[PDB]
Each structure stands twice: as C-alpha cells, then as structure tokens.
Design a protein around this motif. Structure first.
Motif, PDB file in Angstrom:
ATOM      1  N   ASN A   1      43.080  33.864  44.276  1.00 48.95           N
ATOM      2  CA  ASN A   1      43.450  32.562  44.818  1.00 48.95           C
ATOM      3  C   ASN A   1      42.819  32.228  46.181  1.00 48.95           C
ATOM      4  N   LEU A   2      41.534  32.551  46.376  1.00 47.22           N
ATOM      5  CA  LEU A   2      40.835  32.178  47.597  1.00 47.22           C
ATOM      6  C   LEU A   2      40.162  30.823  47.393  1.00 47.22           C
ATOM      7  N   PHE A   3      40.331  29.947  48.373  1.00 47.91           N
ATOM      8  CA  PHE A   3      39.748  28.612  48.409  1.00 47.91           C
ATOM      9  C   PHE A   3      39.005  28.441  49.722  1.00 47.91           C
ATOM     10  N   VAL A   4      38.115  27.454  49.778  1.00 47.45           N
ATOM     11  CA  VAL A   4      37.533  27.051  51.047  1.00 47.45           C
ATOM     12  C   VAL A   4      37.761  25.554  51.208  1.00 47.45           C
ATOM     13  N   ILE A  19      43.624  22.130  58.424  1.00 48.08           N
ATOM     14  CA  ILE A  19      42.509  22.950  57.985  1.00 48.08           C
ATOM     15  C   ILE A  19      41.198  22.342  58.472  1.00 48.08           C
ATOM     16  N   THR A  20      40.193  23.212  58.594  1.00 49.49           N
ATOM     17  CA  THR A  20      38.866  22.892  59.108  1.00 49.49           C
ATOM     18  C   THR A  20      37.831  23.107  58.011  1.00 49.49           C
ATOM     19  N   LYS A  21      36.860  22.192  57.921  1.00 47.84           N
ATOM     20  CA  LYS A  21      35.746  22.348  56.989  1.00 47.84           C
ATOM     21  C   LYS A  21      35.221  23.783  57.029  1.00 47.84           C
ATOM     22  N   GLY A  22      35.034  24.368  55.854  1.00 50.72           N
ATOM     23  CA  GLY A  22      34.524  25.719  55.725  1.00 50.72           C
ATOM     24  C   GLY A  22      35.553  26.811  55.879  1.00 50.72           C
ATOM     25  N   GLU A  23      36.779  26.478  56.268  1.00 55.53           N
ATOM     26  CA  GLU A  23      37.806  27.489  56.467  1.00 55.53           C
ATOM     27  C   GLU A  23      38.202  28.090  55.133  1.00 55.53           C
ATOM     28  N   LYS A  24      38.249  29.412  55.083  1.00 56.68           N
ATOM     29  CA  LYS A  24      38.750  30.092  53.911  1.00 56.68           C
ATOM     30  C   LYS A  24      40.263  30.061  53.940  1.00 56.68           C
ATOM     31  N   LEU A  25      40.867  29.855  52.785  1.00 59.24           N
ATOM     32  CA  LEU A  25      42.310  29.904  52.765  1.00 59.24           C
ATOM     33  C   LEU A  25      42.758  30.483  51.443  1.00 59.24           C
ATOM     34  N   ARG A  26      44.012  30.902  51.419  1.00 53.05           N
ATOM     35  CA  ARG A  26      44.658  31.372  50.206  1.00 53.05           C
ATOM     36  C   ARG A  26      45.675  30.335  49.772  1.00 53.05           C
ATOM     37  N   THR A  54      38.468  23.880  47.494  1.00 54.99           N
ATOM     38  CA  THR A  54      37.798  24.234  46.257  1.00 54.99           C
ATOM     39  C   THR A  54      37.898  25.744  46.094  1.00 54.99           C
ATOM     40  N   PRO A  55      38.060  26.224  44.861  1.00 55.34           N
ATOM     41  CA  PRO A  55      38.227  27.662  44.661  1.00 55.34           C
ATOM     42  C   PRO A  55      36.935  28.415  44.890  1.00 55.34           C
ATOM     43  N   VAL A  56      37.099  29.662  45.320  1.00 52.52           N
ATOM     44  CA  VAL A  56      35.985  30.521  45.661  1.00 52.52           C
ATOM     45  C   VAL A  56      35.776  31.647  44.650  1.00 52.52           C
ATOM     46  N   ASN A  57      36.833  32.148  44.024  1.00 49.41           N
ATOM     47  CA  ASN A  57      36.741  33.318  43.159  1.00 49.41           C
ATOM     48  C   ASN A  57      37.541  33.071  41.884  1.00 49.41           C
TER      49      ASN A  57
END
Length: 57
Positions: A1-4, A19-26, A54-57
C-alpha cells in the motif's frame, strides 16, 4: 500500500492531512476509504484526495 502524491494538497481541517508533490505515503486499509482515503506520512495520518495520489507497488 505505498503511494506517491501527484500534487500538493493543504489540509483545511476535518482530519485532512497535508501532502507534498512526490511525497511517499502509505494508504491505510481504512474500512471507509473512498473519494478520500486515509493516508499516513511522517507528518501524521488523515484524509487526502484519492485522485491526488497514485500507487507505487
């Protein structure tokens, strides 16, 4: 559940989370995720717009 985060978003209150552009979040598997979803970063947890991430993984 990693998103950016795609775009900056500034909390306005009501349990929202900045949140900030490019910040990774769960994204927590909150039972009530929807158009808004409960995110977690080093700055806390709270609602962010689902179309701003948007999801990362």
């Amino acid at each position: 559940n990693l998103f950016v985060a795609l775009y900056d978003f500034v909390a306005s209150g009501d349990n929202t989370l900045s949140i900030t552009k490019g910040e990774k979040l769960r994204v927590l598997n909150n039972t009530e995720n929807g158009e808004w979803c409960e995110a977690q970063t080093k700055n806390g947890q709270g609602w962010v717009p689902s179309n701003y991430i948007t999801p990362v993984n």
